[PDB]
Design an enzyme around this catalytic site. Structure first.
Site, mmCIF file in Angstrom:
data_model
loop_
_atom_site.group_PDB
_atom_site.id
_atom_site.type_symbol
_atom_site.label_atom_id
_atom_site.label_comp_id
_atom_site.label_asym_id
_atom_site.label_seq_id
_atom_site.Cartn_x
_atom_site.Cartn_y
_atom_site.Cartn_z
ATOM 1 N N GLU A 1 78.063 37.733 28.449
ATOM 2 C CA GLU A 1 78.762 36.653 27.747
ATOM 3 C C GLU A 1 79.990 37.176 27.005
ATOM 4 O O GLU A 1 81.091 36.630 27.140
ATOM 5 C CB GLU A 1 77.835 35.909 26.776
ATOM 6 C CG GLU A 1 78.531 34.707 26.108
ATOM 7 C CD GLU A 1 77.605 33.852 25.252
ATOM 8 O OE1 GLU A 1 76.405 33.716 25.581
ATOM 9 O OE2 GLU A 1 78.092 33.289 24.249
ATOM 10 N N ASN B 1 83.766 37.833 15.437
ATOM 11 C CA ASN B 1 84.230 39.215 15.394
ATOM 12 C C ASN B 1 83.567 40.021 14.275
ATOM 13 O O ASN B 1 83.359 41.216 14.416
ATOM 14 C CB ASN B 1 85.762 39.266 15.362
ATOM 15 C CG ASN B 1 86.361 38.919 16.721
ATOM 16 O OD1 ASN B 1 85.622 38.719 17.686
ATOM 17 N ND2 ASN B 1 87.683 38.870 16.807
#
Ligand SMILES: Cc1cc2nc3c(=O)[nH]c(=O)nc-3n(C[C@H](O)[C@H](O)[C@H](O)COP(=O)(O)OP(=O)(O)OC[C@H]3O[C@@H](n4cnc5c(N)ncnc54)[C@H](O)[C@@H]3O)c2cc1C
Ligand SMILES: Cc1cc2nc3c(=O)[nH]c(=O)nc-3n(C[C@H](O)[C@H](O)[C@H](O)COP(=O)(O)OP(=O)(O)OC[C@H]3O[C@@H](n4cnc5c(N)ncnc54)[C@H](O)[C@@H]3O)c2cc1C
Ligand SMILES: Cc1cc2nc3c(=O)[nH]c(=O)nc-3n(C[C@H](O)[C@H](O)[C@H](O)COP(=O)(O)OP(=O)(O)OC[C@H]3O[C@@H](n4cnc5c(N)ncnc54)[C@H](O)[C@@H]3O)c2cc1C
Ligand SMILES: Cc1cc2nc3c(=O)[nH]c(=O)nc-3n(C[C@H](O)[C@H](O)[C@H](O)COP(=O)(O)OP(=O)(O)OC[C@H]3O[C@@H](n4cnc5c(N)ncnc54)[C@H](O)[C@@H]3O)c2cc1C
Lengths: 380, 377, 380, 377
Positions: free
Chosen positions: D241, D365
């Protein structure tokens, strides 16, 4: 223009610069070689009224306002960062004596601090704790009319010259919270059990006599207690506002100096049939440095004004300290690079300025501690 | 992917050699300002100098991956050892590529043994980046060249027994670069003198010096290649030069990361390892990421280079980006050590002082961006 | 605190905010949907004295100082960036009429600018030239009592609503240097040959009616010349100081708004059994944003003071403009990220703030032009 | 190095298909807020959906490099096409890896044809990054699961005919993650409803929606794998992914760079191309450099992934660094277009709005840095 300087400060700056042009600028490189600035320099500073000028006239001072200290510290940084020991004596350590000393203590110590007969230092940091100051383990155990001091202090500015050392120690190691067991104790030269290490070899500040201090059953008169037992942490937290401001002022000046060096260099260096200053990337890099310097100058000047007005500005001084020191580091990196190979040569002043700057992000509280303080004040 | 089992075995053996001959002595060398010729001799006798040189001159016909291993392992000792990489992979390749059969026979054997240490002299007080504007002259007065000029920042400037000197054999060449030749200047050439070891921010054991030519009498058979084609030889060889710098900077970043990670894992504050504070974790994660990017990139460039492909853009990218990354790593490393990062007793202090010059030599990072921009059309 | 605001400005801010709480805040999203702010809003602004308040009482103004304009523009940005057309009318365009207009022109135009019956715009930028303003090619050729205008202007703020447009055109295309052929000409609504484009679809500022303007043999009375022929470039360079300051003020406010949004969000969002604001990386990111915001606020406030004192501060306003706009862009990027998936959803206010900010680095002169100006002032 | 001639030929053919079926229609799709099912049908009939699926279900047994080509070519059209990559390379692999022979036979053929479009539903209003803290329940009332909860930000949320739903089959699992299962929810399940298409900053043609389960009756044979092992399946599949996101962001950066370079080369100011000003040259050189670093890194990660090696750290590095790099490219691109960068008539405006969400999905992130820090020990 910043409102804290009047004509008297402007004439003072010129007079002080004249002193330094003879006594400091031409001697600085020799001092770095020796690893220490001679005592005779401090004596000259004292006799000319450039030490502790804020001290009351009754101890031999000049009752000068803080703007005089700003001028002194800026002008000394213009010479070099190894002169930080003077600002430390003037504006960091001796204020502890004036603020928290008894009349007897002030009478005994302040006159000689003004003349430079006594040089001061402050010792908080230990091998095991710097940022985590509440965790210091130097002990002072009462025994009759004395404190028996055991411990080690590290990275002490004026570590060799200092005749009076303000020492943070645990008078009650078992106190809850730990910080309530901290006291400030003045340790005088030639105290039995008090020794000093060899001067520390550092990346820069080569003329600053940084050293470790050792207390092996140091016999310190109980008279030398500064303030109240167990309130030492409170005195420290209070005075660190001015301490951080002094560091911010010196870093701002260092950036301004380094910018001037770089601008002058690229204006006189030719490459590809042009002055280096004619290339657009060089122009923009300088424009960006100039902008950030202008920001730091405007901010520190405002903080000085707030400070002088007697306002509590813990947040703003922490902002000034971390941001200006990082900015000056970035200036230094740009400056070395723009000098080409010459920026790496010790014959060029920029090399020394570059080595001197990065420690400003570490002392007076690391920049990580400054961000911690800011976040706390933001209420999160 | 350029390292085979033979290279892994070689790395271990070379490291063992350095644990004996280099690591324990490095701090002393720095205090002396020079690495003793005795070390160079030990390197030569063990086959660690110019290993790529054909067996017929006493080399090993080793591929470039051996040079990668040597230069990496030397950097792990310290950046003052860059003179060996310069000898092995920067200067001596000029002799093998452009030397006559007779010059190779005369010089290459002694470069392998370390009897002759090499240097290359391009930069002048007046011109570094602008290399086409060099003014050192070499005027024929058969069978000699009379050389006049000054060269600055010369690596191995004191030790060097052979110096490859870029000079103008036709100062009226128009276009100027067409008047450049390479001339080998030997130790004890009349009129050839050297400056004092330069005092630098770091690389304290690397003997960098200025060179002076005042009517220096150089034999005409010391011309390397053809007259007026020197600039072409230089532009050709600068790709490997830039690759060597990128490799050394990459290795420095890795070393500094390891020092920092170990420090923050052993140092405690506020009841935790420094490495347990989330900001420290993220800073280390970012450093690890950029290090991985640089390693992957330089490794691919090495592969392309060994395949004989032109890598001008890519090597220029590797050189500037990795040196800037290594500088950022250094700044993080000092900060995360606290006061100890500023103390010369800690290795990180020396690593910090050593790194920033990598952005300057082999061509400034500004020159690297200039090259990249030109290739972008 | 910044010295340009007194109690009267503080009560004014509260009164103006009360107006906006009814008339602007609840309507803003609808305005964005429609692509334009209704004329009725300007009419309400005018009747309440919030348009051109600095204009003399004899034209219906309030003789207000520049601090009133600072308050207005800050409070409007707190609503949203699509309201920039008001600050443009108030503080960018109408000052040209007051500074360079004849008594007849001021009498004819200023009263309606105060009431909002006439909305103003300024047209410099062309398809072929923005940064390179000296290279504009719109011509105005004298023919009897008229200027015949031919050309195209692009990205014009208030492009649909504007009834009076200050147009930069070349009255002498052959002049040397080219900039000496530029003049300012006021173009009124319903001028023959003057048409407007459909409203431009943009990344943000969705409620601002930005449009292109077309002049196909536009017949403009010679009476409409503003100032002297061939001095147009000088008027522009002079007024761009205030223009850039206005942009800096709006960007500073936008950053402050976005910070407040982010701080409030992370304080109420929980993850891993903690408020998001409890993670150290979030604390430091906010501390860093707070620091940079403090720097920009202190600097812009100082520049406002200098400006109000009548001082020439070309360098400092260029510094303020580029640095604050870039800083606000960085704030916006941090803000979106710290909201997680929600920062990308148009139902959250931060999405719109994020889309609105980046153009501030482009208009009133690109940030590259700001650095160019700074480098020129540094003497390189 | 994972692309062979067959892949280059395939790229050309797929691009030709998109020049006809996608490029001319994309702006219309964005205005519609959805990509029509007719496009999905054309993709399926041409073999561009789930090409890796075994031939026995109607797939092509294609290697992962075909998926790389498809996803890259789709991004060059635009980011709203990410739903196809999600179908092909994110969701359908769950069915092939953990489905019974009977489920595969029932579902995989129609995923290849595009008769069934897939989605995966992990995130809830109350929990995204903190996935172990999901509260959607699936309680057995044989032979059904009764499902209660809400899922947010679901890609293909409107089109999807099969949704892989992460839910707590044992909310008292202690440790909580041990109570997670994957349950396939089919279109027209009683008590299963969808929210309105979400209004987003970009990805305007991607049909993102919330999903609602109010006593939804789901057949127990729709359980995917074993009860209580859902978290393990998710952690396993998240590596591919994250790789898919990195690949798409890398491609977006390349596209935006090309747009910017072309613009500044055609735009003139002050008697020069904008691309001739030195600051613009250096900015483009820096963008080109970071793009090259990302390309080299992601290509190496793809190679490692295809070799069947565990790449958890590396893919997390690629995901965060490349998405941040692509964001920086976007910011440079808008600025360098001047006012035109802010105009919706220019493609760069849409690219700019599309990119920043890549730093958020497939895990933020910040979560990527968390993973890297954990692996650094
Ligand atoms: C030139 C010099 C002169 C000095 N002079 C004096 C002096 O005169 N008197 C005196 O008392 N001291 C002096 N010092 C000490 C100085 O103040 C300390 O070095 C400083 O406070 C940092 O402490 P430390 O070195 O023990 O680093 P540490 O406290 O061990 O910290 C190491 C690193 O970990 C980071 N860190 C720690 N906690 C956290 C956290 N919670 N979150 C994120 N990061 C964290 C720090 O920011 C730092 O980067 C001097 C130091 C120098 C370098
Ligand atoms: C440790 C060390 C070892 C060295 N060893 C050698 C050696 O062995 N052999 C050798 O030949 N040389 C050697 N050098 C020289 C080195 O390669 C040069 O320092 C370097 O090429 C830059 O040249 P310069 O120092 O003259 O800087 P300059 O060319 O004067 O440039 C100074 C600055 O100006 C800027 N600049 C110049 N032109 C432009 C432009 N057009 N656009 C934007 N910016 C520009 C650059 O940013 C640079 O930062 C060594 C240098 C060092 C520091
Ligand atoms: C929302 C909005 C509203 C606007 N409203 C108005 C208005 O009301 N009135 C009006 O007159 N204008 C208006 N404008 C125009 C705006 O001022 C211009 O877009 C701006 O000045 C830049 O000009 P440009 O778009 O033509 O870009 P260009 O001038 O073509 O520049 C494109 C890029 O190249 C760069 N560049 C150019 N030269 C150099 C160089 N020498 N060195 C380095 N980089 C360089 C620029 O910085 C920019 O990044 C508006 C624009 C926007 C986006
Ligand atoms: C376009 C789009 C499509 C999506 N498609 C799908 C889909 O198909 N299927 C699916 O399951 N989900 C999907 N999502 C959800 C996406 O994965 C989540 O938005 C993402 O995982 C973050 O979760 P969150 O939005 O709840 O943010 P939160 O988890 O609430 O976090 C918000 C912010 O808090 C910070 N944060 C949280 N914890 C920490 C910490 N410990 N330390 C430091 N910072 C922290 C992060 O920085 C983050 O920026 C999609 C989202 C978008 C925007």
């Amino acid at each position: 223009t910043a409102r804290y300087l009047r004509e008297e400060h402007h004439m003072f700056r010129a007079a002080f610069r004249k002193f330094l042009e003879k006594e400091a600028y031409p001697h600085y490189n020799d001092w770095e070689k020796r690893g220490i600035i001679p005592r005779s320099f401090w004596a000259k500073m004292g006799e000319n009224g450039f030490l502790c000028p804020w001290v009351d006239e009754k101890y031999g001072g000049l009752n000068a306002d803080f703007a005089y200290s700003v001028v002194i510290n800026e002008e000394l940084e213009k010479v070099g960062s190894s002169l930080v020991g003077i600002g430390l004596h003037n504006d960091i350590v001796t204020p502890y004596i004036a603020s928290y000393g008894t009349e007897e203590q002030k009478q005994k110590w302040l006159p000689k601090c003004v003349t430079g007969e006594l040089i001061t230092a402050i010792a908080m940091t230990e091998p095991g704790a710097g940022s985590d100051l509440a965790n210091i383990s130097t002990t002072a155990v009462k025994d009759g009319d004395y404190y028996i001091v055991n411990g080690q202090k590290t990275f002490i500015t004026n570590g060799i010259h200092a005749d009076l050392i303000v020492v943070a120690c645990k008078t009650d190691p078992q106190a809850k919270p730990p910080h309530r067991g901290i006291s400030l104790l003045v340790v005088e030269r030639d105290t039995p059990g008090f020794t000093r290490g060899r001067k520390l070899e550092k990346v820069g500040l080569h003329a600053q006599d940084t050293a470790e201090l050792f207390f092996q059953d140091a016999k310190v008169p109980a008279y030398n207690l500064l303030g109240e037992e167990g309130k030492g942490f409170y005195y420290l937290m209070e005075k660190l506002q001015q301490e951080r401001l002094v560091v911010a002022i010196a870093a701002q000046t260092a950036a301004e100096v380094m910018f001037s060096l770089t601008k002058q260099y690229v204006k006189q260096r030719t490459a590809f049939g042009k002055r280096v200053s004619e290339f657009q990337t060089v122009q923009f890099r300088l424009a960006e440095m100039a902008t950030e310097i202008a920001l730091g100058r405007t901010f520190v000047d405002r903080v000085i004004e707030e400070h002088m007005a007697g306002k509590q500005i813990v947040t703003e001084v922490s902002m000034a300290k971390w941001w200006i020191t990082e900015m000056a580091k970035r200036v230094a990196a740009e400056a070395m690079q723009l000098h080409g190979g010459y920026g790496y040569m010790e014959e060029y002043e920029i090399a020394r300025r570059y080595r001197d700057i990065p420690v400003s992000a570490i002392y007076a509280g690391t920049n990580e501690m400054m961000k911690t303080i800011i976040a706390r004040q933001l209420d999160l």
